[PDB]
Design a protein around this ligand. Structure first.
Ligand SMILES: CCCCCCCCCCCCCCCCCC(=O)OC[C@H](CO[C@@H]1O[C@H](CO[C@H]2O[C@H](CO)[C@H](O)[C@H](O)[C@H]2O)[C@H](O)[C@H](O)[C@H]1O)OC(=O)CCCCCCCCCCCCCCCCC
Ligand code: CLA
Ligand code: CLA
Ligand code: CLA
Ligand code: CLA
Ligand SMILES: CCCCCCCCCCCCCCCCCC(=O)OC[C@H](CO[C@@H]1O[C@H](CO)[C@H](O)[C@H](O)[C@H]1O)OC(=O)CCCCCCCCCCCCCCCCC
Ligand SMILES: CCCCCCCCCCCCCCCC(=O)OC[C@H](CO[C@@H]1O[C@H](CS(=O)(=O)O)[C@@H](O)[C@H](O)[C@H]1O)OC(=O)CCCCCCCCCCCCCCC
Ligand SMILES: CCCCCCCCCCCCCCCC(=O)OC[C@H](COP(=O)(O)OC[C@@H](O)CO)OC(=O)CCCCCCCCCCCCCCC
Ligand SMILES: CCCCCCCCCCCCCCCC(=O)OC[C@H](COP(=O)(O)OC[C@@H](O)CO)OC(=O)CCCCCCCCCCCCCCC
Ligand SMILES: CC1=C(/C=C/C(C)=C/C=C/C(C)=C/C=C/C=C(C)/C=C/C=C(C)/C=C/C2=C(C)CCCC2(C)C)C(C)(C)CCC1
Ligand SMILES: CC1=C(/C=C/C(C)=C/C=C/C(C)=C/C=C/C=C(C)/C=C/C=C(C)/C=C/C2=C(C)CCCC2(C)C)C(C)(C)CCC1
Ligand SMILES: CCCCCCCCCCCCCCCCCC(=O)O
Ligand SMILES: [Fe+2]
Lengths: 36, 32, 34, 65, 505, 115, 37, 82, 28, 38, 341, 30, 33, 30
């Protein structure tokens, strides 16, 4: 019903996006599409 | 025929302006 | 008393499932070398 | 209203305002003709588009001979 | 009072004045037709259908009269160039005159129906209220449409009792009005087959008669009557506008792409004929053929009809115009006088070179000469200092075969460049720019103007369709929504089915 | 330049030297201005759609509102009930103050960025 | 035969006059350059 | 009001929701990853790999130039890589 | 080929694990 | 006479009929099962 | 109470996401158009149709990915999967540009679906259908730019490709080739879009700064009840303010909100017409009077002549790479160039 | 003549501004 | 400048015709009340 | 253009004849 506090779910989904987005930006400087 | 090019506008406005005057006056007479 | 499988359920997973699949494919892509 | 000779002749043609067949009437038969006409426009379109290519049908000015 | 944008709604419940208005509209449209033709007759030059056809002269309705068989003037000329003909009463002038007489007669009938609006015919015999049985009217009018459509195809287009229609060869060299026989096979759907136009009007005419008979005898189902508000004349306006914009999109496309009913001698070439080098292929085909059988270069090219060469020239490409470049194409590049001949370029090493032709997208294009393999061998440079390929360096010359400069060769670089700047437009013509005081800038043809107007009107009539369709289906709330709409009806959950009060929870 | 074509000259030169189309602050500006036009049309259509019937068909519905009347002239719940169903319920405002603040904020902020 | 019952007065308030005149004059200002060309 | 579906806020804080989805979400992520790492995505969709845009001593685009032979043209280019 | 099961297997097991964890409540 | 593109035409015509008919079969079934109360 | 009415019942049930009869057309088409765009931009190249990379898989980012248009050699082929070009081969379909027509066509029918949805929901809820009417402007823009414009040109190739940078190139193309900024129909579109955004911001700001004090807190949002009868801000004070600041002000809330519908809807309709002309190359490219003078008078210069030089640079410098099927070879010496640059 | 035309229109717009502001229909309350 | 000579009549009628129309409607509105 | 102008004015006058006769203010015996 409400076992997992909502703020927790939001914090953890939060870094979830930060991680995937930061991966995509590291990828702009490495490998395909880096110009190198 | 090598006529005057401002002839067209002079004729057109000569008709248009006074005629619109009269139309304006007639229509507002009718609606009172 | 809530139903689990609804129209709503279907609309969500119709977007959510392939979104995560695509996220995985795109993350893999960051490691491709030329 | 004013009666005229031509009016009295045409009269029955404008006399059934509001009359309907009951229920769905010929709606299923209409739907069939609609379906046939869609397919038929499809063909006509795809012929013009060169997406449907047919034997002896050359979609070019060179079909004037 | 009524707002200005609603003055014409006073006709919604007045069938007689509705007819009066429709008569006046029809009077005006026919009057226009007659006026437009007279203006075009007074400005048309019939003296050269080869290099000054009607479509170079800004002619708009002349080609539609010609399309269905009106080809001559009481003055003695015909648009095919034949002279001393006697068109009978159905000349361009007589057609124009009939539309003006028709206009005047429609005008008078409009007056009568406007005054005598209150005809018993328009009253519902049971309730005494004005009413129009729109389902039966549809059947009557559809039956009539089908009779006319069938007769048009069975008598006019076949020549059974009528002139036929304009047909031509694939290169628009030899067109004329001929009777056309039906094409009943699948090539009748080929837009470029004139026999299909005949078969269409026969078969569709017969279907229209049958459908018309159905719609006169069979009443509409109650479900459908209710769904489409068939007691409301505005539902007819909504669907009628939709059919009209459908028809408008179709005629714009076939004008732009070309079909048997938009022949190039009445409307001009299409842009696709330039994109695909359609006439240039055919011209080369004939020069090759003339050469294989041993004719000289001068002979092979002199055999090229000027009319065909004039199609292979971008000034007749309808996609070279501009919105506010007004008037006839002649007003731009001029009145074409003669084909100057086919320009052949060669460099100092005798190799033949080919001017890269201007694509329709480009207002301006550089002058680039290639060899048969596509390798650049000469150009006119912009920056001169590091020029590799100048006409001066490469020794480029121009020689003419056929036409007015046949057998002439030019070697002075400025002259040679001058022709190379024209060779990007295709074949080279001599124009009269003085007579019309032509400004030198390409205009579009009637094919272009017609397509633009009709594509635009179509899109706009789609909005009309949406507006009047909405008005029909939402008549009850036109002036506003119910001031007693209760909040339980628009809030979620109260009713199982949205809006249906019988599905309360 | 203070002129119509002068303006376009400025834009073409600016794109060549700054690749402004590829700048995020210009992209936000387009979003502020496209969205501003969007929400202008939305809000105008939703309010116009839920005008309470106060007039006949022969008069402009605009005469259903008198300057300084205290009662609202449209039904905001009917507008919410339409819009929440067009998308889904919680993607619709029923608080007029939040809505009109949204209307102010979106183009203002987008145009700040593009400036 | 009775007079036609479907007739209605027509109206244009002052504000609509000002709105329409602005529309026409600005439209003329915009297209005039193109008419003169 | 409400239309009867279970509220989202109630679902994503529920233990059962996360029991199922801590499997489905990474499983999908991994599946997507594998689609790329195996090279299957290249083959399904026809996308050139970094080594196969050009033949070695070539700088011409293998540009499709025919409408109805276009299928064969692309295959002709791919064969100029084997 | 072989890569297609490799890709599909996480999805299929994801679908199994959800099926088995929800099946009772879906019956109701 | 029966060309490849005419065969493809029927392929697409059939496939689309499958999609519409299946879709409607499904919707009619669900609408029968889960009715509204009046 | 046959099957049709039973189905109507189900489609129209009040649920979290309304379906309707319009849903049958809307939801498949919207999902497929959306899915095609996400699929193409993630996995599909434009190498064979354009000589461009265009997906995440190939190294592109969100700004440079696109579903690009098919090759100019497809003409206006519908490019059906089962059609004569791809012949049911999915892979070839992708390489030949088939996803473009897929997205364009399914998108077109989704837009129809969505506008029918606005009609359906409005009828059931009991409101006037002005939101549907307003949406006619997005539709006109979409069909005129994505469908009508390429249909007038040689092929779909010259339509916009579905991508951020690809749309940027579309903008610049229209400047260099059509001189689109000079087009009075675009200018009316500009005034409508900027006019709308202004109206949007000025109407929201005005309401928020003519609020009545209806609660006690510094957050004024809480002091509104959506069922209250009273206006939540003073039209009277708003009218005074704007009358004294600007000269004129709205006095009728109905006109005001109709005007907000009118301005951007009309603006978009106008630009669509201009694009229809550009389908035919019916451009507002030049002013003849300017050119006659300039040719004869080499000291006569205007911002008009300065912008055509720019257009001529755009054309010559982007044409070879942007229209690869034309095999344009422009040697260095023919490229137009000012001094030094 | 084109200069006269352009300035004539512009000047009609400024005069209209004067009337729209100082000679508007006054807004009256309820 | 060598401008199109019908531009003047085009522009004059373009202004005059619809303006006159509006003025006719406005004045007869005022003589009603 | 001048032919069209002469004929247009002549046409308008013939139209005015029609209205002046058939749509005159009816003289009525007061
Ligand atoms: C608003 C509501 C929104 C509703 C949403 C609708 C969503 C779906 C709409 C369906 C889209 C239909 C597009 C059909 C493609 C098209 O047209 O396809 C084009 C084909 C014609 O094909 C083209 O034809 C051209 C000319 O060909 C001719 O010329 C050549 C050289 O001269 C050769 O002779 C050749 O053999 C000969 O055919 C070129 O060959 C092109 O490459 C080839 O594509 O016509 C055809 O299929 C059909 C042509 C006639 C039908 C006209 C259709 C109406 C729409 C067109 C309006 C555009 C108006 C243009 C103004 C700008
Ligand atoms: C379907 C309609 C149609 C078409 C396609 C043509 C096509 C043609 N005509 Mg014809 N003509 C028509 C109707 C048509 N005409 C009508 C109705 C008349 C009577 C007025 C004429 C009178 C006529 C004459 C007298 C002449 C032609 C000529 C010509 C040729 C050149 C046209 C040209 O330069 O246009 C250029 C057109 C424009 C620049 C028009 C642009 C439209 C403006 C900008 C729109 C205004 C915008 C609007 C205010 C939108 C804002 C609204 C918003 C605020 C709400 C061409 C073949 C000429 C020719 O060569 O004859 C031999 C010629 O001299 N026509
Ligand atoms: C066969 C086509 C047709 C017919 C018979 C009607 C009929 C009607 N329309 Mg519809 N309409 C149509 C097409 C049509 N419309 C199209 C294509 C559109 C989209 C542009 C609309 C958009 C539309 C709107 C938005 C509205 C109507 C309204 C109305 C009603 C009142 C109209 C009125 O008094 O205008 C009076 C108009 C004038 C006095 C002057 C208008 C002048 C325009 C700007 C330019 C002049 C054009 C020129 C003279 C000739 C036409 C050129 C070309 C089309 C041939 C009436 C039933 C009104 C309504 O619903 O009221 C209930 C309304 O609000 N119509
Ligand atoms: C409402 C949903 C909808 C709509 C409008 C469209 C519309 C379209 N699709 Mg999409 N599509 C959909 C759902 C939809 N699709 C779904 C659900 C899928 C996934 C399965 C797809 C997958 C898809 C692909 C993969 C492709 C399309 C394509 C197309 C286009 C061509 C369709 C065509 O030629 O139809 C032809 C068929 C019909 C019009 C059906 C007619 C049915 C009538 C009513 C009955 C006919 C009788 C029947 C044949 C009798 C059977 C005989 C038997 C007993 C032997 C068109 C824009 C193509 C495209 O975009 O081109 C690039 C394409 O390649 N669609
Ligand atoms: C002051 C700057 C300015 C302004 C305000 C405008 C304003 C406009 N321009 Mg111009 N433009 C300018 C400068 C400017 N322009 C310059 C300098 C150039 C260089 C020449 C151009 C070149 C240009 C081109 C080439 C075109 C325009 C177009 C337009 C119009 C776009 C209308 C629109 O919203 O389409 C947005 C698109 C739509 C409304 C279509 C339907 C959208 C549907 C509803 C999308 C639904 C999305 C769905 C939910 C899925 C989303 C998922 C996804 C996001 C992940 C608008 C009138 C276009 C136009 O006039 O076409 C009519 C056009 O084609 N402009
Ligand atoms: C209000 C709107 C205007 C009303 C309608 C227009 C009516 C105009 C009628 C006058 C026509 C003007 C002549 C035709 C056009 C023409 O070409 O003009 C054009 C001429 C100008 O002339 C132009 O000049 C050009 C260089 O400047 C070139 O030379 C052109 O060739 C030449 O046409 O217009 C004028 O000269 C107008 C002068 C007006 C003053 C006239 C002085 C006489 C006044 C005494 C009249 C008393 C009569 C009382 C009767 C009781
Ligand atoms: C190759 C072809 C590929 C494409 C093929 C497409 C085929 C068409 C498939 C269409 C499927 C959409 C229908 C979804 C219905 C649903 O999922 O069931 C949910 C319903 C049952 O749940 C119920 O849900 C109800 C609420 S509601 O209807 O879901 O809103 C509730 O009333 C009830 O109590 C509850 O048990
Ligand atoms: C031979 C052919 C004859 C052609 C005749 C000419 C056509 C007739 C005239 C048409 C012009 C009508 C103008 C009506 C103008 C006018 O009446 O507007 C006000 C008017 C108010 O409508 P209401 O419903 O309040 O009705 C009040 C009534 O008195 C109206 O009759 O709104 C409507 O007309 C709706 C359309 C508004 C249109 C909005 C445009 C105004 C915006 C101004 C922006 C200017 C641009 C500057 C910014 C860059
Ligand atoms: C910045 C732009 C957004 C404006 C801000 C929003 C202001 C309006 C919010 C007010 C409501 C406030 C109540 C608090 C709650 C709140 O504001 O909203 C959050 C809302 C919470 O609702 P639940 O019922 O889950 O929770 C109960 C709570 O509301 C109690 O506080 O959840 C969502 O709406 C989830 C939406 C995700 C949906 C996933 C996708 C669904 C598929 C859609 C397919 C598309 C539709 C079809 C297209 C045609
Ligand atoms: C009475 C009578 C008569 C007479 C008649 C007449 C003489 C007629 C005429 C008529 C006419 C003579 C008509 C005409 C008309 C015209 C019109 C109707 C026009 C229209 C136009 C328009 C509408 C246009 C528009 C536009 C513009 C302006 C711009 C551009 C765009 C557009 C196109 C939109 C007679 C003796 C026979 C007989 C007895 C009786
Ligand atoms: C085409 C096709 C098809 C279909 C398909 C589909 C339907 C697809 C889908 C797909 C999809 C459905 C996909 C999805 C994806 C997604 C994604 C990929 C997403 C992403 C996202 C992101 C990345 C975000 C993030 C962020 C940021 C960055 C910032 C802010 C925040 C946020 C969170 C928003 C078929 C089979 C029929 C066949 C034909 C072809
Ligand atoms: C309007 C309803 C039509 C919507 C669905 C139509 C499309 C349905 C998907 C059809 C895809 C299957 C056929 C594609 C492969 C053709 C087989 C082949 O030619 O090799
Ligand atoms: Fe508001």
């Amino acid at each position: 019903g409400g076992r997992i506090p909502l703020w927790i779910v939001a914090t953890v989904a939060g870094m979830g996006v930060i991680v995937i987005v930061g991966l995509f930006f590291y990828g702009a400087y490495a490998g395909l599409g880096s110009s190198l | 025929m090598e006529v005057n090019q401002l002839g067209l506008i002079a004729t057109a406005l000569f008709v248009l302006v006074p005629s619109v005057f009269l139309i304006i006056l007639y229509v507002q007479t009718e609606s009172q | 008393s809530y139903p689990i499988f609804t129209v709503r359920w279907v609309a969500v997973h119709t977007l959510a499932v392939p979104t995560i699949f695509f996220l995985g494919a795109i993350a893999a892509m960051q490691f491709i070398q030329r | 209203a004013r009666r005229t000779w031509l009016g009295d002749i045409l009269r029955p043609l404008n006399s059934e305002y509001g009359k309907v067949a009951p229920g769905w009437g010929t709606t299923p038969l209409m739907a069939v003709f609609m379906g046939l006409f869609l397919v038929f426009l499809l063909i006509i379109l795809e012929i013009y588009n060169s997406t449907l290519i047919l034997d002896g049908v050359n979609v070019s000015w060179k079909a004037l001979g | 009072g009524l707002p200005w944008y609603r003055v014409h709604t006073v006709l919604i419940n007045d069938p007689g004045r509705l007819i009066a208005a429709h008569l006046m509209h029809t009077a005006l449209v026919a009057g226009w037709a007659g006026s437009m033709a007279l203006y075009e007759l007074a400005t048309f030059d019939p003296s050269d259908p080869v290099l000054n056809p009607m479509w170079r002269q800004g002619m708009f309705v002349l080609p539609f009269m010609a399309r269905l068989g009106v080809t001559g003037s009481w003055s003695g000329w015909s648009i095919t160039g034949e002279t001393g003909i006697d068109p009978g009463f159905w000349s361009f002038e007589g057609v124009a005159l009939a539309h003006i007489v028709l206009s005047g007669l429609l005008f008078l009938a409009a007056c009568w129906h406007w005054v005598y609006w209150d005809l018993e015919l328009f009253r519902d015999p049971r309730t005494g209220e004005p009413a129009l049985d729109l389902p039966k009217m549809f059947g009557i009018h559809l039956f009539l449409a089908g009779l006319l459509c069938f007769g048009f195809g069975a008598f006019h287009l076949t020549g059974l009792f009528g002139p036929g229609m304009w047909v031509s060869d694939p290169y628009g060299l030899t067109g004329s009005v001929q009777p056309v026989a039906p094409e009943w096979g699948p090539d009748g759907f080929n837009p470029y087959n004139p026999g299909g136009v005949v078969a269409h009007h026969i078969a569709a005419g017969i279907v229209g008669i049958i459908a018309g008979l159905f719609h006169i005898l069979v009443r509409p189902p109650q479900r459908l009557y209710k769904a489409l508000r068939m007691g409301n004349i505005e539902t007819v306006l909504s669907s009628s506008i939709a059919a009209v914009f459908f028809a408008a999109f179709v005629v714009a496309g076939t004008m732009w792409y070309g079909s048997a009913t938009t022949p190039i001698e009445l409307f001009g070439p299409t842009r696709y004929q330039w994109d695909s080098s359609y006439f240039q292929q055919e011209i080369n085909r004939r020069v090759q053929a003339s050469l294989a059988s041993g004719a000289t270069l001068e002979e092979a090219w002199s055999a090229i009809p000027e009319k065909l060469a004039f199609y292979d020239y971008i000034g007749n490409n309808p996609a070279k115009g501009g919105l506010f470049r007004t008037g006839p194409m002649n007003k731009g590049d001029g009145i074409a006088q003669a084909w100057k001949g086919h320009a052949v370029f060669r460099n100092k090493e005798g190799e033949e070179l080919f001017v890269r032709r201007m694509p329709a997208f480009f207002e301006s294009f550089p002058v680039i000469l290639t060899d048969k393999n596509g390798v650049v061998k000469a150009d006119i440079p912009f920056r001169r200092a590091e020029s590799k390929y100048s006409f001066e360096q490469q020794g480029v010359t121009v020689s003419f075969y056929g036409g007015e400069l046949n057998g002439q060769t030019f070697t002075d670089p400025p002259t040679v460049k001058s022709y190379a700047r024209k060779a990007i437009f295709g074949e080279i013509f001599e124009f009269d720019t003085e007579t019309l005081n032509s400004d030198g800038i390409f205009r579009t043809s009637p094919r272009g103007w017609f397509t633009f107007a009709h594509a635009v009107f179509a899109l706009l009539f789609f909005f009309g369709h949406i507006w009047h369709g909405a008005r029909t289906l939402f008549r009850d709330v036109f002036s506003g929504i119910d001031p007693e709409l209760s909040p339980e009806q628009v809030e979620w959950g109260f009713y199982q089915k949205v809006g249906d009060v019988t599905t309360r929870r | 330049p203070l002129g119509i074509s002068g303006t376009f000259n400025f834009m073409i030169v600016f794109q060549a030297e700054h690749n402004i189309l590829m700048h995020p602050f210009h992209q936000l500006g387009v979003a502020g201005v496209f969205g501003g036009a969007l929400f202008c049309a939305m809000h105008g259509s939703l309010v116009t759609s839920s005008l309470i019937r106060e007039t006949t068909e022969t008069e402009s519905a605009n005469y259903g509102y008198k300057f300084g009347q205290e009662e609202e002239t449209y039904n905001i719940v009917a507008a919410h009930g339409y819009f929440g169903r067009l998308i889904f319920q919680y993607a619709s405002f029923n608080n007029s103050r939040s809505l009109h603040f949204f209307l102010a904020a979106w183009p203002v902020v987008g145009v700040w960025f593009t400036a | 035969m009775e007079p036609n019952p479907n007739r209605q007065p027509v109206e244009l308030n002052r504000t609509s006059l000002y709105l329409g005149l602005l529309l026409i004059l600005v439209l003329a200002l915009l297209f005039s350059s193109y008419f003169f060309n | 009001g409400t239309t009867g579906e279970r509220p989202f806020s109630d679902i994503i804080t529920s233990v059962r929701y996360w029991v199922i989805h801590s499997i489905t979400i990474p499983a999908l992520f991994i599946a997507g990853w594998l689609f790329v790492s195996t090279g299957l995505a290249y083959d399904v969709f026809g996308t050139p790999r970094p080594d196969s845009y050009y033949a070695q001593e070539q700088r011409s685009i293998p540009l499709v130039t025919d409408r109805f032979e276009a299928k064969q043209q692309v295959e002709t280019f791919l064969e100029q890589l084997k | 080929d072989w890569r297609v099961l490799v890709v599909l297997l996480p999805v299929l097991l994801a679908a199994g694990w959800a099926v088995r964890n929800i099946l009772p409540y879906a019956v109701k | 006479t029966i060309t490849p593109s005419l065969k493809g035409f029927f392929i697409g015509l059939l496939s689309g009929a499958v999609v519409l008919g299946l879709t409607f079969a499904v919707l009619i079934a669900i609408s029968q099962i889960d009715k509204v109360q009046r | 109470r046959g099957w049709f009415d039973i189905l109507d019942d189900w489609l129209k049930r009040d649920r979290f996401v309304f379906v309707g009869w319009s849903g049958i057309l809307l939801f498949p088409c919207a999902y497929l158009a959306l899915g095609g765009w996400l699929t193409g931009t993630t996995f599909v190249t434009s190498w064979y149709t354009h000589g461009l990379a265009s997906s995440y898989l190939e190294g592109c980012n969100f700004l440079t990915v696109a579903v690009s248009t098919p090759a100019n050699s497809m003409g206006h082929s519908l490019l059906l999967l089962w059609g004569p070009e791809a012949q049911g081969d999915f892979t070839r379909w992708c390489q030949l540009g088939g996803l473009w027509t897929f997205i364009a066509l399914h998108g077109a029918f989704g837009l129809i679906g969505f506008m029918l949805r606005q009609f359906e929901i409005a009828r059931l809820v009991g409101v006037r259908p002005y939101n549907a009417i307003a949406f006619s402007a997005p539709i006109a823009v979409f069909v005129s730019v994505f469908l009508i414009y390429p249909l007038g040109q040689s092929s779909w190739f010259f339509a916009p490709s579905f991508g951020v940078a690809a749309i940027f190139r579309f903008l610049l193309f229209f400047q260099g080739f059509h001189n689109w900024t000079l087009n009075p129909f675009h200018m009316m579109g500009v005034a409508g879009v900027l006019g709308g955004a202004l109206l949007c911001a000025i109407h929201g700001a005005t309401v928020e700064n003519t609020l009545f004090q209806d609660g006690e807190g510094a957050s004024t949002f809480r002091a509104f009840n959506p069922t209250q009868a009273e206006e939540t801000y003073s039209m009277v004070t708003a009218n005074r303010f704007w009358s004294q600041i600007f000269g004129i002000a709205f006095s009728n809330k109905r006109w005001l909100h109709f005007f907000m519908l009118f301005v951007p809807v009309t603006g978009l309709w106008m630009s669509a017409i201009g694009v229809v002309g550009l389908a035919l190359n019916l451009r507002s490219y030049d002013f003849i009077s300017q050119e006659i003078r300039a040719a004869e008078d080499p000291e006569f210069e205007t911002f008009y002549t300065k912008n055509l030089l720019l257009n001529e640079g755009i054309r010559a410098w982007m044409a070879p790479q942007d229209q690869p099927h034309e095999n344009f070879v422009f040697p260095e010496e023919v490229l137009p160039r000012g001094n030094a640059l | 003549m084109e200069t006269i035309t352009y300035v004539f229109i512009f000047a009609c717009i400024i005069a209209l501004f004067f009337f729209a502001i100082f000679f508007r229909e006054p807004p009256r309350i309820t």
